[PDB]
Amino acid sequence: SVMLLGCEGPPPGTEQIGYRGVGMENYYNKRQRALSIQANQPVESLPAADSTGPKASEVYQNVQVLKDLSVGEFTRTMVAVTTWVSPKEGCNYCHVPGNWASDDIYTKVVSRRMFELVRAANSDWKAHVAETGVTCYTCHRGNPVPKYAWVTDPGPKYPSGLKPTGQNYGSKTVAYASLPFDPLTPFLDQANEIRITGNAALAGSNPASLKQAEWTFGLMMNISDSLGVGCTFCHNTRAFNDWTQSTPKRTTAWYAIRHVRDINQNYIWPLNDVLPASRKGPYGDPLRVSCMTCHQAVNKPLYGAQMAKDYPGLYKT
Amino acid sequence: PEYQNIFTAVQVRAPAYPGVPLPKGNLPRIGRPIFSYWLGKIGDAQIGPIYLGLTGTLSIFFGLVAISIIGFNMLASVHWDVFQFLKHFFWLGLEPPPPQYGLRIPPLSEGGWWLMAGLFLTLSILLWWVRTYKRAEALGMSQHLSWAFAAAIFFYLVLGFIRPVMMGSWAKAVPFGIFPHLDWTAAFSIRYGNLYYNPFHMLSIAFLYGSALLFAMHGATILSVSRFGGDREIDQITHRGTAAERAALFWRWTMGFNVTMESIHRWAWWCAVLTVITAGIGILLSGTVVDNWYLWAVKHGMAPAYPEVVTAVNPYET
Amino acid sequence: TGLTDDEAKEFHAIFMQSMYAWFGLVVIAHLLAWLYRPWL
Amino acid sequence: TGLTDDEAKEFHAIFMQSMYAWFGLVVIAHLLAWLYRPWL
Amino acid sequence: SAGITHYIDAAQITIWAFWLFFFGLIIYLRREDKREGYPLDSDRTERSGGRVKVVGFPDLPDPKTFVLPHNGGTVVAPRVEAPVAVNATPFSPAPGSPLVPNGDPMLSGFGPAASPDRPKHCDLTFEGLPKIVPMRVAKEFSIAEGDPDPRGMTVVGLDGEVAGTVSDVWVDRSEPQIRYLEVEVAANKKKVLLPIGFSRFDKKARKVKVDAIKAAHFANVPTLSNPDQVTLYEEDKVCAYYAGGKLYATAERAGPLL
Amino acid sequence: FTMNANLYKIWLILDPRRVLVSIVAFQIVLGLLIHMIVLSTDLNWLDDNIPVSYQALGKK
Amino acid sequence: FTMNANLYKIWLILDPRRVLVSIVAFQIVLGLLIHMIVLSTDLNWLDDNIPVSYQALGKK
Amino acid sequence: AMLSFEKKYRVRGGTLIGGDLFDFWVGPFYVGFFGVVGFCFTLLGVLLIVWGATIGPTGPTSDLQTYNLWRISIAPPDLSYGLRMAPLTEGGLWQIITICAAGAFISWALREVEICRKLGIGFHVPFAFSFAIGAYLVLVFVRPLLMGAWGHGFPYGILSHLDWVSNVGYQFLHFHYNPAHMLAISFFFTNCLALSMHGSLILSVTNPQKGEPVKTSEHENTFFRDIVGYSIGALAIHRLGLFLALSAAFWSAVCILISGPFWTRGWPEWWNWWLELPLW
Numbered sequence A: 001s002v003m004l005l006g007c008e009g010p011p012p013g014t015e016q017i018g019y020r021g022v023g024m025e026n027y028y029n030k031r032q033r034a035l036s037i038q039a040n041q042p043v044e045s046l047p048a049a050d051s052t053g054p055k056a057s058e059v060y061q062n063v064q065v066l067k068d069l070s071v072g073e074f075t076r077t078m079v080a081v082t083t084w085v086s087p088k089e090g091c092n093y094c095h096v097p098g099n100w101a102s103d104d105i106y107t108k109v110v111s112r113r114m115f116e117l118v119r120a121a122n123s124d125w126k127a128h129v130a131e132t133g134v135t136c137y138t139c140h141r142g143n144p145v146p147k148y149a150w151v152t153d154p155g156p157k158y159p160s161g162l163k164p165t166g167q168n169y170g171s172k173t174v175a176y177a178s179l180p181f182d183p184l185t186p187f188l189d190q191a192n193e194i195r196i197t198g199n200a201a202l203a204g205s206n207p208a209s210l211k212q213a214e215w216t217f218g219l220m221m222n223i224s225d226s227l228g229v230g231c232t233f234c235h236n237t238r239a240f241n242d243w244t245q246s247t248p249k250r251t252t253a254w255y256a257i258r259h260v261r262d263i264n265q266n267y268i269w270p271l272n273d274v275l276p277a278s279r280k281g282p283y284g285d286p287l288r289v290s291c292m293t294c295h296q297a298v299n300k301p302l303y304g305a306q307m308a309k310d311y312p313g314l315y316k317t
Numbered sequence B: 001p002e003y004q005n006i007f008t009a010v011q012v013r014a015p016a017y018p019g020v021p022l023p024k025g026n027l028p029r030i031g032r033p034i035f036s037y038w039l040g041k042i043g044d045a046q047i048g049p050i051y052l053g054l055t056g057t058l059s060i061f062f063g064l065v066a067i068s069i070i071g072f073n074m075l076a077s078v079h080w081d082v083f084q085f086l087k088h089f090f091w092l093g094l095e096p097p098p099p100q101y102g103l104r105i106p107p108l109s110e111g112g113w114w115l116m117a118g119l120f121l122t123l124s125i126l127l128w129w130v131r132t133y134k135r136a137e138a139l140g141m142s143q144h145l146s147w148a149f150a151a152a153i154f155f156y157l158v159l160g161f162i163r164p165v166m167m168g169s170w171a172k173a174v175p176f177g178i179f180p181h182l183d184w185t186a187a188f189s190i191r192y193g194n195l196y197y198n199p200f201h202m203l204s205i206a207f208l209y210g211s212a213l214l215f216a217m218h219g220a221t222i223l224s225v226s227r228f229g230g231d232r233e234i235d236q237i238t239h240r241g242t243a244a245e246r247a248a249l250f251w252r253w254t255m256g257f258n259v260t261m262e263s264i265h266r267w268a269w270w271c272a273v274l275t276v277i278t279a280g281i282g283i284l285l286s287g288t289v290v291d292n293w294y295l296w297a298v299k300h301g302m303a304p305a306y307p308e309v310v311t312a313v314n315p316y317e318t
Numbered sequence C, D: 001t002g003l004t005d006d007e008a009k010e011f012h013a014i015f016m017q018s019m020y021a022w023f024g025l026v027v028i029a030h031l032l033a034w035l036y037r038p039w040l
Numbered sequence E: 001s002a003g004i005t006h007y008i009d010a011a012q013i014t015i016w017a018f019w020l021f022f023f024g025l026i027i028y029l030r031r032e033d034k035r036e037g038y039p040l041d042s043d044r045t046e047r048s049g050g051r052v053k054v055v056g057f058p059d060l061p062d063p064k065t066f067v068l069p070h071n072g073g074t075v076v077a078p079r080v081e082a083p084v085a086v087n088a089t090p091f092s093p094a095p096g097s098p099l100v101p102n103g104d105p106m107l108s109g110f111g112p113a114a115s116p117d118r119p120k121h122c123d124l125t126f127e128g129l130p131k132i133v134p135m136r137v138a139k140e141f142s143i144a145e146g147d148p149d150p151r152g153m154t155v156v157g158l159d160g161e162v163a164g165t166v167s168d169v170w171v172d173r174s175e176p177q178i179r180y181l182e183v184e185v186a187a188n189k190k191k192v193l194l195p196i197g198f199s200r201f202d203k204k205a206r207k208v209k210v211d212a213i214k215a216a217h218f219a220n221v222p223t224l225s226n227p228d229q230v231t232l233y234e235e236d237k238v239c240a241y242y243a244g245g246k247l248y249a250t251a252e253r254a255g256p257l258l
Numbered sequence F, G: 001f002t003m004n005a006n007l008y009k010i011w012l013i014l015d016p017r018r019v020l021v022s023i024v025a026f027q028i029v030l031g032l033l034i035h036m037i038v039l040s041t042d043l044n045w046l047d048d049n050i051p052v053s054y055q056a057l058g059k060k
Numbered sequence H: 001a002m003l004s005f006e007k008k009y010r011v012r013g014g015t016l017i018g019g020d021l022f023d024f025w026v027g028p029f030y031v032g033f034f035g036v037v038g039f040c041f042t043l044l045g046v047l048l049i050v051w052g053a054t055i056g057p058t059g060p061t062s063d064l065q066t067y068n069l070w071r072i073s074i075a076p077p078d079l080s081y082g083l084r085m086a087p088l089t090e091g092g093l094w095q096i097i098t099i100c101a102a103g104a105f106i107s108w109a110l111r112e113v114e115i116c117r118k119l120g121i122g123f124h125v126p127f128a129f130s131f132a133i134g135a136y137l138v139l140v141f142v143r144p145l146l147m148g149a150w151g152h153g154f155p156y157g158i159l160s161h162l163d164w165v166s167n168v169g170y171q172f173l174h175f176h177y178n179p180a181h182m183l184a185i186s187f188f189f190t191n192c193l194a195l196s197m198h199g200s201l202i203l204s205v206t207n208p209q210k211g212e213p214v215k216t217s218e219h220e221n222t223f224f225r226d227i228v229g230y231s232i233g234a235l236a237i238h239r240l241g242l243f244l245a246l247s248a249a250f251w252s253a254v255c256i257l258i259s260g261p262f263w264t265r266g267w268p269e270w271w272n273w274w275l276e277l278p279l280w
């Protein structure tokens, strides 16, 4: 042996997706479903805060985001942001001791930007986030650094004589498959074309390359894996491009891809100058966002637990 | 109980046989034989001698060159760490020139090795072709192999050489890697709108299933009449025996008609040659003639409709 | 069937009584099954 | 079945007592299982 | 107008081309299928006195000649074969009914015991020496290191009785292998062939089982008109007898089961 | 409602051993079939747990 | 419900080794089978965490 | 009607069941008890596939109803029915048709069995057939069972079953990475090679260049030994081919048996056991 090998027992949990007989179905491990559920547990809310009081911007010195919050509510919001992003470190993580109003430590200029990142998320991307919305926790999980944040990767080494395959390697990025190992930068950072399928049967009006097909395939494998599902979750594989035969999750995923293009482009890249080398990859690019970061292998972060509705301070205006 | 003719239960030896004599021009034969008691457990235990002419040597030569470019490239891709090479081997591969290059001969570091391995591989394959025709002539026999090999070469050429050139892009040929070439297959189907609705690929699939059906049937038959020396198909073909009779009759009583000891080999031959011949046709038309087979099938009303029980609104249209 | 006319009297006897024995165990289990949990 | 009439009384005896022994182990385990965790 | 979509594209017309070549192919293979066994046997032919030779669709292909090597002959297909009586009688006079073999089923040479008349000459090596010959004729041959030598094992029929013992081993001079077992029969010390296909080994016991026939039947094994070689005719005659035991050697292989 | 019984004669026409395994096999199959039918239906006894569903003895 | 004391003759009709090994195979099969059958229902006895969760809270 | 050498073999008996009851021929087909049963299973099956084509998924007047040969399709019930019999017009029909198909194939096999018993030939064919029957059963009986519902079976329709294969395969992201799949594919391919080589050989020797006589066993072996240094030999190639084809069916049956019931994750991920060994 030639060991044998990697295997689950019967019966798997199953779900019918499409019409009977069409083959659109999903299988899953009950064990791992219960463990995943236990690991994707949400932090209970802090009691709502009364008030009825002056606005935060009236009692504090450097409040550029969480303005219209009552003092009480602001305080509540601070306690949540503390346990949510850096509970082992507490208040002092993002503040200059003795001086709550100072921005003299980077983790705060960043915290500020992330208050605008979450607010933007919950109020502008519902076609994506619905009524669950997002919170600090979604990515942080009691951690200062989202465990599942990413960076553009260079692949393994190549002598100077030859250039990288761009694909062809053992990569848990692309589900272990051999497609290209960084299908994120061109799709979840930049906004390259995913579409390769022609809309006409005969040819002469679709320049899509086979290579483009493999890149779309790699990216798709990533996506599938990050939300922890299969193509029948969003598609009808007889026609990947056919939108009417897809599931409303394809629609949601469409809007999500754009959302990650906005998080990575106008909220994370700009923070690259005030962040330390420890938070940067070999090309100087910074740890950014992907679908995994938030979903962490589940179709809805924390199995669609609704955390944000309890904190009004995470919504715009 | 009764022997099944699966395992030679008791074998016998005689001095190895260097074989029927070739006329002048067909060079000596090389190597001197050996017997593997285990091959012998299931088949002729004789290993070789082999023939190697100009053709054969020039083919072994080209072929090993091609295998070296592919391999060396794979070791290079994991940095000459042979451990890593061993670890990702299944995932290692030599990708093709990028499209930016079209059909031009590209730099070493960008695909030129693929074009050289592709070049040398094809030449070595077609030389092995000629080899099998020569080897088939020295014996006065016919070119049935060579017409099949020519069919399989046809598909190969269609995959990595004919379609790429027609499509004006070496990047469309298949890359050398186990898992990589698996991905090329899948990506290939995806890019051209689900290859399942491509009729030629359905026929080729009918012919592959059929090569399995025919060899399974015929093989089962011949073993079932192996008690009558039915395996000795040559003399059952010239002097029909109760083996060829019981054989043809088993099928006659089961499905109503039958063939003969000689003709079943024609059904088999044609069915194998057919896989590769529908297959190549199938690839020939992908991108050159049809770009989206699912669509093609809809245009010819072959694609089924199911109650639309699940659907998604198209964001490109909002 | 290489039986005598009497070894079809004998066999028939053991066969019938045995089959009836089976039917007996059957009425036991179906009886218990109905008592604990009627199905009709 | 290459047995004598003298050796199927003997065999049947051994078969029966052994089989019943099995059924005993079974009834035991079904009893312990029912106690630790009744299933009906 | 630079858009008049044509409804016929290269894939249609190429699938059409395929189907036409296909039909011609099928037909052709079905013609090669009638190079033997044809024209068929009906009571349509006999009722009509013969003006209805049965051949179906397609028709029969012109004879083809096989030129056997070594002064062997010339064979044709399709050919005209002389009818041959049936060693049996209709289980029913109604058509499609089977026939019951006449006499002692294994002797009948009917049913699993039937066989045609192949040449009364021998298959030959490339050189032209009798292909199938015994190891006694084929001096060179030899058992494979680590294989019980069949020579000296006991041949035993289907009901466990000894039949005889292996007196020699016949081999292929063309494709080195055991083709036949020789059996010095116990009951009359006459020599018979036993096809390998009918023989099972019991190596730890040095036995050679035969579910095919009973020990006694070994007495009637068809014989060789020469003990140092065998003819095509004789190979069929030998195997078919054993085959008969598969349905005849017991008053039960006859079936049913229920 | 005619007179001749003596239906023992039945074993003069049908082989007893084969009848035996035929019945034994049929009973085992019919058994698995019926078992599968009731357990896949309402009269089911497994997907219940007495006195309490046991994987709801642990919310945790 | 009483023993026809000529039920030894059953072994004059049915081969002892075959009936025996048949029983062993049938039984071992049913056994492995059932074990999974129960493990597939609510009554699971493996995945319960008794008396304390064995892994951790997570990786820690 | 009979072949010109057939009457001499048309013996009586050999059944498994029926004896003289159905022990007769019809044209060239042998009937027998399993042929009568088979014909019943088959006829009712097909005739029902005909009623399904007649009614369509939404009724005989609906646009989805159809008699177009490419699109007619009878699909299983939803999963909500589990292993119960589902209403006729809700996948029930498919279940019955399935019972008929399985029964017809098993009957067919048993009839080839009675036919082997008659002709006195080996039972290699119906045994081999039984591998396809096995494959069919995992695809309609075993797998959907292990999966708590008959709805996991593939539909009976020319292209709809292709769609089934497609989406079930893609539920695992990249099926090509299924290792049993890789095996099975290799056997189907190798089978296709041996078949093409055997075919070629026989036809290359029994019909040589004009001017040459029927070739010999010596030629046969000398040729493949000339080209590739080995010849497995006549008998064995019939043995190998049977190995390749039956194995191809086998590994297909196991490759699909493990897709669900024994593996739920994507398939390329399986290969993780290889990137994670403590060698690297």
Ligand code: BCL
Pocket (backbone or CB within 6 Å): C025, C026, C027, C028, C029, C030, C033, F024, F027, F028, F030, F031, F032, F043, F045, G007, G010, G034
């Ligand atoms: C709510 C439904 C009830 C239930 C209702 C019933 C009912 C009702 C019946 C059964 C029956 C049986 N059930 Mg239940 N059963 C339940 C749950 C189970 C479970 C389980 C894991 O939960 C199991 C393993 C079983 C298993 C069994 C088998 C012991 C038996 C049928 C076997 C058979 O076909 O005979 C195969 C054929 C044979 C010949 C073997 C018979 C073996 C038995 C033990 C007797 C041995 C005699 C031996 C054969 C004598 C041989 C002679 C010697 C050679 C001389 N049940 C549920 C709880 N079960 C049947 C039964 O037992 O009949 C009384 C029956 O009528």
Ligand code: BCL
Pocket (backbone or CB within 6 Å): B201, B202, B203, B205, B206, B207, B209, B210, B213, H046, H049, H101, H136, H139, H154, H157, H158, H159, H161, H162, H165
């Ligand atoms: C293996 C996974 C899928 C599958 C994969 C594929 C793929 C992939 C393809 C097919 C294709 C087809 N499959 Mg399929 N197929 C499967 C299981 C089956 C079963 C079954 C009951 O088990 C059947 C009957 C069929 C039958 C068929 C035919 C509709 C067609 C060509 C068969 C062929 O040439 O093969 C070789 C066998 C022969 C040549 C023997 C000739 C017998 C003919 C061809 C079969 C007649 C089918 C008949 C038209 C309808 C069934 C009978 C009706 C009940 C009357 N498939 C499984 C479920 N099948 C091919 C196609 O073109 O369909 C679009 C194709 O591309």
Ligand code: BCL
Pocket (backbone or CB within 6 Å): B067, B121, B125, B152, B153, B155, B156, B159, B185, B186, B188, B189, B190, B195, B196, B200, B201, B204, B205, B206, B208, B275, B276, B278, B279, B280, B281, B282, B283, H165, H189
């Ligand atoms: C993955 C997504 C698509 C898919 C996409 C494709 C694509 C794309 C292709 C196929 C191809 C094939 N597919 Mg498909 N296929 C799918 C699903 C299926 C299913 C199924 C049950 O669903 C089946 C049965 C098949 C079956 C088949 C085969 C019938 C067919 C060609 C077989 C072959 O051997 O050619 C292989 C034989 C050869 C290439 C010739 C080999 C000869 C060479 C010269 C040997 C050289 C040896 C070398 C020199 C030795 C040295 C080694 C060096 C290392 C290289 N596909 C799915 C739907 N399929 C072909 C096709 O149909 O195209 C229309 C093809 O290219």
Ligand code: BCL
Pocket (backbone or CB within 6 Å): B185, B186, H105, H132, H133, H134, H135, H136, H137, H139, H165, H166, H167, H168, H169, H170, H174, H175, H176, H181, H184, H185, H188, H249, H251, H252, H253, H255, H256
């Ligand atoms: C779609 C995405 C995945 C895919 C998903 C699947 C799935 C899912 C499956 C396969 C299956 C298989 N795939 Mg695939 N497959 C892919 C790509 C490929 C490629 C390729 C070139 O890339 C190939 C070669 C294959 C090939 C294979 C075969 C190994 C295998 C089917 C064998 C089989 O059915 O035997 C079995 C044969 C039978 C069941 C027929 C039994 C015959 C019965 C008894 C008789 C029928 C009689 C009938 C009535 C005849 C009608 C005649 C009329 C009456 C006259 N796949 C793509 C990548 N593939 C199937 C498999 O794994 O094996 C089952 C399967 O379920």
Ligand SMILES: CC[C@H]1c2cc3[nH]c4c(c3C)C(=O)[C@H](C(=O)OC)c4c3nc(cc4[nH]c(cc(n2)[C@@H]1C)c(C(C)=O)c4C)[C@@H](C)[C@@H]3CCC(=O)OC/C=C(\C)CCC[C@H](C)CCC[C@H](C)CCCC(C)C
Pocket (backbone or CB within 6 Å): B059, B060, B061, B062, B063, B064, B124, B125, B126, B128, B129, B132, B145, B146, B148, B149, B150, B151, B152, B272, B273, B274, B275, B276, H189, H190, H192, H193, H196, H197, H227, H228
């Ligand atoms: C109906 C078409 C089917 C088919 C048919 C087919 N294949 C064929 C043929 C035919 C008719 C041949 O005539 C030919 C053959 O040779 O058959 C045995 C062949 C062939 N099919 C093969 C492969 C093949 N065919 C395939 C497919 C198919 N072939 C279809 C199923 C497949 C697939 C897709 O699975 C494969 C992988 C090869 C065995 C053979 C072609 C071999 C060839 O072209 O050789 C090129 C050169 C080399 C491989 C270099 C030789 C490498 C040596 C092993 C090294 C030895 C070293 C030595 C010790 C010397 C020392 C070195 C010195 C430099 C120091």
Ligand SMILES: CC[C@H]1c2cc3[nH]c4c(c3C)C(=O)[C@H](C(=O)OC)c4c3nc(cc4[nH]c(cc(n2)[C@@H]1C)c(C(C)=O)c4C)[C@@H](C)[C@@H]3CCC(=O)OC/C=C(\C)CCC[C@H](C)CCC[C@H](C)CCCC(C)C
Pocket (backbone or CB within 6 Å): B209, B210, B212, B213, B216, B217, B220, B254, B255, H038, H041, H042, H043, H044, H045, H046, H049, H097, H098, H100, H101, H102, H104, H105, H108, H109, H112, H125, H126, H127, H128, H129, H130, H131, H132, H133, H155, H156, H157, H158, H161, H245, H246, H249
């Ligand atoms: C296992 C190795 C290969 C194999 C072996 C094999 N198949 C065999 C045999 C053997 C040894 C036979 O002896 C037997 C035969 O008779 O030879 C032609 C057979 C057989 N191979 C056949 C088919 C077949 N084998 C296949 C494959 C395989 N069989 C493997 C490749 C395939 C595929 C899918 O590739 C097919 C289609 C049949 C022609 C024949 C068995 C036919 C038979 O048994 O007839 C009785 C049944 C009917 C006449 C029809 C019954 C009617 C049903 C009620 C309706 C059918 C419903 C069906 C389920 C719907 C499917 C719809 C499709 C559109 C999808």
Ligand SMILES: CC(C)=CCC/C(C)=C/CC/C(C)=C\CC/C(C)=C\CC/C(C)=C/CC/C(C)=C/CC/C(C)=C/CC/C(C)=C/CC1=C(C)C(=O)c2ccccc2C1=O
Pocket (backbone or CB within 6 Å): B214, B217, B218, B219, B221, B222, B243, B244, B245, B247, B248, B249, B251, B252, B254, B255, B257, B258, B259, B260, B261, B264, B267, H043
């Ligand atoms: C309502 C009611 C009363 C009904 C009326 C009855 C009706 C409708 C009658 C119509 C009559 C007709 C036309 C139809 C009957 C249809 C039947 C029952 C079904 C057909 C069943 C059947 C299995 C058909 C399948 C056909 C196909 C193509 C099978 C694939 C196999 C294949 C490629 C076939 C051809 C090649 C064959 C036969 C090879 C067999 C073969 C092999 C394999 C050898 O190795 C061998 C070696 C040495 C000598 C001979 C042989 C040999 O003959």
Ligand SMILES: COC1=C(OC)C(=O)C(C/C=C(\C)CC/C=C(\C)CC/C=C(\C)CC/C=C(\C)CC/C=C(\C)CC/C=C(\C)CC/C=C(\C)CCC=C(C)C)=C(C)C1=O
Pocket (backbone or CB within 6 Å): B006, H190, H193, H194, H197, H198, H199, H201, H202, H220, H221, H224, H230, H231, H232, H233, H234, H235, H237, H239, H240, H242, H243, H246, H247, H250
């Ligand atoms: C006229 O006769 C002919 C000859 O005779 C002269 C020839 O010599 C020749 C020349 C023939 C050859 C050179 C043969 C060539 C064969 C080739 C190229 C095939 C390639 C095969 C390999 C490389 C070996 C692959 C196989 C293995 C390594 C074994 C692996 C074992 C595995 C996976 C586990 C086994 C278990 C299973 C598969 C599970 C269950 C399987 C079954 C139940 C199958 C049952 C099988 C039988 C046989 C009853 C021809 C063509 C010919 O036609």
Ligand SMILES: COC(C)(C)C/C=C/C(C)=C/C=C/C(C)=C/C=C/C(C)=C/C=C\C=C(C)\C=C\C=C(C)\C=C\C=C(C)\C=C\CC(C)(C)OC
Pocket (backbone or CB within 6 Å): B067, B068, B070, B071, B072, B075, B105, B115, B117, B118, B119, B120, B122, B123, B156, B157, B159, B160, B161, B173, B174, B175, B176, B177, B178, B181
């Ligand atoms: C460390 O390693 C050492 C021993 C050096 C060597 C090791 C070598 C190894 C292990 C190599 C491993 C190789 C493997 C596993 C290769 C696998 C390859 C696979 C699976 C390929 C699959 C498909 C490939 C195809 C179909 C390729 C098609 C390519 C074609 C048809 C190319 C045609 C090109 C031509 C004819 C070139 C024309 C050149 C012209 C003349 C046009 O230029 C002007």
Ligand code: HEM
Pocket (backbone or CB within 6 Å): A060, A061, A062, A063, A064, A065, A066, A067, A078, A079, A081, A082, A083, A085, A086, A090, A091, A093, A094, A095, A100, A101, A102, A107, A108, A109, A110, A111, A112, A113, A115
């Ligand atoms: C319980 C612990 C904490 C307390 C008591 C607390 C308290 C406060 C107070 C009183 C202010 C207003 C100070 C001012 O603007 O003058 C403030 C602002 C702010 N704090 Fe916190 N804080 C806590 C934890 C955190 C954590 C963990 C983060 C980041 C993860 C954070 C990020 C911020 C940011 C960015 C501002 C500026 C707010 C804006 O522009 O809206 N605080 N905090």
Ligand code: HEM
Pocket (backbone or CB within 6 Å): A194, A195, A196, A197, A198, A216, A217, A220, A221, A223, A224, A227, A229, A230, A231, A233, A234, A235, A240, A241, A242, A249, A250, A251, A253, A254, B190, H170, H173, H174
């Ligand atoms: C590994 C299997 C998968 C494959 C092979 C795959 C393949 C593809 C392909 C080829 C396209 C392009 C279709 C076209 O060109 O019009 C596509 C688009 C898309 N897929 Fe996927 N997919 C997979 C899984 C998923 C999953 C799980 C989701 C959702 C979470 C998803 C969501 C989407 C969306 C929204 C689009 C449209 C993107 C756009 O138009 O920019 N796919 N997929």
Ligand SMILES: [Ba+2]
Pocket (backbone or CB within 6 Å): A026, A027, A028, A229, A230, H264, H265, H266
């Ligand atoms: Ba899954």
Ligand SMILES: [Ba+2]
Pocket (backbone or CB within 6 Å): F041, F042, F043, F044, F045, F046, F047, F048
């Ligand atoms: Ba219940």
Ligand SMILES: [Ba+2]
Pocket (backbone or CB within 6 Å): F054, F055, G042, G043, G044, G045, G048
């Ligand atoms: Ba429990």
Ligand SMILES: [Ba+2]
Pocket (backbone or CB within 6 Å): G053, G054, G055
């Ligand atoms: Ba633990």
Ligand SMILES: [Ba+2]
Pocket (backbone or CB within 6 Å): H276, H277, H278, H280
């Ligand atoms: Ba490690």
